[PDB]
Structures are given as C-alpha cells and as structure tokens.
Ligand binder design. Structure first.
Ligand SMILES: [Zn+2]
Ligand SMILES: [Zn+2]
Ligand SMILES: [Zn+2]
Length: 266
C-alpha cells in the first residue's frame, strides 16, 4: 500500500543560492542578490528601493548586503518586482516584516503575490512562497519617485500576466545611464497554444517582445542574469558581455518561435 507523495520543495541550482558581495552597476545601483539571481538596490538620499529579492531564503543575505551599503532596515522604502514567482519575490513577505518597505506592483502581480504564487497559470502549486500584500497598485507607464530617482513601469505580460520592466536613469562618470530591468521572456514548460487559463498568451508575448525592444536601455539587466549575458561572478567585467534590450527581445522571440513549433509537433 502506497502513501501519497511527500511535498516537493522548490529546489534550484546552487548558483542561484550562492551569496555575493554588492556589485555596483552605476552610481546608485547595486546588484545585492546571489551569483545567479538579481536583486537590485537603488540608494537615494531619501531611502532605498529594492527591485526583486530572489528566493525565500535570501532575506537575511539581502539585509546583510544592505547593511554593508549603509542602508538599515528602516531606510528601505520600496520594493518593486519583475514578476511574482518564488525565485524573484520569494522573500518579500519577510522583508516587509523586517523593514520599512512597502510594495508597489500591478494588479496581476499583486494578486499572484497575495496567493504566494499558488494556483499559478502554468506551475499550479509547484512553486510557492510566503504571501505578501501590495501597498500600491501601479498602471502601465506609471512612475514612482524615491529620493529624486524616477522609476517607470512597462507592462510586458507573458512569463506571468503581471510581468513588468522597470526603467530609471542613474549616472556613471558624470553621464546618464538609462537602466532597463526587463523581466523574463521565457515560457518554461508552458502550454503556449490554446491554453484555457491564458487564451491570448501568444499575442501578449509578441507585444512584450516589442515593448522590450523599444525600452530606454543603455544597460539591460534581467532577473536571471544569464538571460542578458551578465556574469555577476566576473567582477569588473560582470556586465561587459551584456545584451542590448533589442538583442534580448530578439533572442527571446526566436526561442519562443522554436518552442511554438516544437509544441505543435509535440
Ligand atoms: Zn545621485
Ligand atoms: Zn518566473
Ligand atoms: Zn525566474
């Protein structure tokens, strides 16, 4: 006689959980997550912004890195998200409890975050995390300002309904640097065609390829750094091989077209 299976934890490649010291991207922007998951700290005179936190177990590491940057828990003002999957929004509930931070997200991302990633359109309950509430709902193109840095939301639905690119202008060498943190454009294991839970999935992805292509984008970063050819473990040449937003979108579209053809054949 055979029991039901044990719950299966969401396990990931070791590099996704490998701590790294803060890596500066521009004057006010740092990568503070792990070697293979992005978490961006943007430091302003009036407090800090975090874009993504990575996995649930990364919360204390993020706070240690924030401390090393001179940002105390009370100084963290705002959390923004690429998308509300466990490997990017994982520690958000805990960060809210341990810091001053409030969350701003679009309605789709807010709804998914509030169910801790459960009943995912594609993953079901396979990949979940502690639920958190959004404090502010943003609309497409809406801006949020913290200590004079202005962040713009660009909706790029597909990977999740609420997938979002965030853009802001930092400086490097007295010159402006237009940073584009573009969300994932993957569809890992997704049913793309005739998906009853996401009927216009293909059209949304196609629109999202165009959105990403057109972002203001001197430097592209992505939640999975490898998608944009970043190597956080490579120090001074971490960003050297980084893709443009144009090249990222193109590569994603080509991958997506191949996946569509494979699905039709499958
Ligand atoms: Zn400044
Ligand atoms: Zn995801
Ligand atoms: Zn991911």
């Amino acid at each position: 006689e055979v029991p039901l299976p044990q719950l299966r934890a969401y396990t990931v490649d070791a590099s996704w959980l490998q701590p790294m010291a803060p890596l500066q991207i521009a004057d006010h922007t740092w990568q503070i997550g792990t070697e293979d998951l992005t978490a961006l700290l943007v430091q302003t005179p009036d407090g800090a912004v975090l874009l993504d936190g990575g996995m649930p177990q990364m919360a204390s590491h993020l706070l240690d890195n924030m401390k090393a940057r001179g940002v105390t828990p009370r100084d963290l003002r705002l959390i923004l998200l690429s998308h509300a999957h466990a490997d990017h929004a994982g520690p958000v509930a805990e960060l809210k409890r341990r810091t001053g931070a409030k969350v701003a997200a679009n309605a789709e991302s807010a709804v998914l975050l509030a169910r801790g990633g459960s009943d995912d359109l594609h993953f079901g309950d396979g990949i979940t995390y502690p639920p958190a509430n959004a404090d502010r709902i943003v609309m497409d193109g809406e801006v949020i300002t913290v200590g004079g840095i202005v962040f713009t939301a660009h909706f790029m639905a597909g990977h999740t309904p609420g997938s979002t690119a965030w853009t802001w202008t930092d400086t490097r060498n007295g010159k402006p640097v237009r940073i584009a943190y573009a969300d994932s454009l993957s569809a890992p294991g997704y049913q793309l065609q005739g998906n009853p839970r996401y009927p216009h999935l293909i059209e949304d992805y196609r629109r999202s390829f165009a959105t990403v292509r057109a972002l203001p984008c001197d430097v592209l970063l992505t939640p999975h750094p490898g998608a944009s050819n970043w190597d956080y473990a490579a120090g001074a040449r971490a960003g050297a091989k980084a893709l443009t937003c144009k090249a990222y979108a193109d590569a994603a579209e080509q991958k997506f077209d191949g996946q569509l053809a494979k699905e039709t054949a499958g």
